[model samples]
Target: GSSGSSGSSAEAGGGIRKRHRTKFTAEQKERMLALAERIGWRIQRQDDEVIQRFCQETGVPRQVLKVWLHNNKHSGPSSG
Candidate 1:
């Protein structure tokens, strides 16, 4: 079941806590890379369908994926 905050707690006042960064597991990264490669690093209606389905299966948000693709398109699988 979904809880109140995700890896964060409520603030002293009424407002909610700032959302923390999302850390994807190694396995998730692998799948994301494979899928992204499969889609030819392009975003379109069909690719949107795949990404949405992948999000459902991997619990990764669309915004996160889009940001990641934009951020790491030039970089390799890792910066490590």
Candidate 2:
């Protein structure tokens, strides 16, 4: 048997939203930069495998790298 408890959509029915945030550590940023430069700052199907391997080793997903690459390419200056 199951308990008769319905109508529990108090805050589950679009009442609020969900947001995701990931903080990139300094080491990860350096690694990602090296990988990004190695790949010419452009992602393509040809090097998808390499990207995946780097992602696994660098602990940053490919999606995150893509976003970072785009953002970093357009802006940001060198630090040393």
Candidate 3:
């Protein structure tokens, strides 16, 4: 039988770790929520076809739209 353990393991927490929190202004949050609502509506109404049209109309990258949807879906209108 072969053991999978390594010869040595590195110690954790050697350096200071910076904690990051996203901060958005009230106006920004409103805009994000609005965009999310639009996307959600589009999804409910036209599904992928509308998303393709949106990508073309806004000239926004598809990945950007996906990230926006992901973040906004989890966060409330007031959350940053």
Candidate 3 on 1-80: residue-level lDDT in tens? 33787545467433333322445445545544566676662244344565666656554444445555565566543443
User: Could you tell me every candidate's TM-score relative to the true structure?
Assistant: 0.62, 0.65, 0.38
**What's the number of clashes in each of the models?**
0, 0, 0
Q: How would you encode candidate 2's per-residue C-alpha lDDT over 1-80 as one tens digit per residue?
A: 43698656455324232223767778778887887778877788787888888888886767777777776777785553
Candidate 3: stretches off by over 4 Å: 1-35, 38-46, 76-80
- Scored by Cα lDDT, where does model 1 land? 0.69
Worst 10 residues of 2 by lDDT: 11-20
Better of 1 and 2 by TM-score: 2
- Top-scoring candidate (TM-score): 2
Evaluate model 3: give its lDDT.
Answer: 0.51
| Ranked by TM-score, top first | 2, 1, 3
Predicted candidate 1 versus true structure: per-residue lDDT over 1-80, tens digit per residue: 44765744445334233333878787677667777778865567778889999898998777676666655578656632
Ten consecutive residues with minimal summed lDDT in candidate 1?
Answer: 11-20
Task: Give lDDT for model 2.
Answer: 0.73
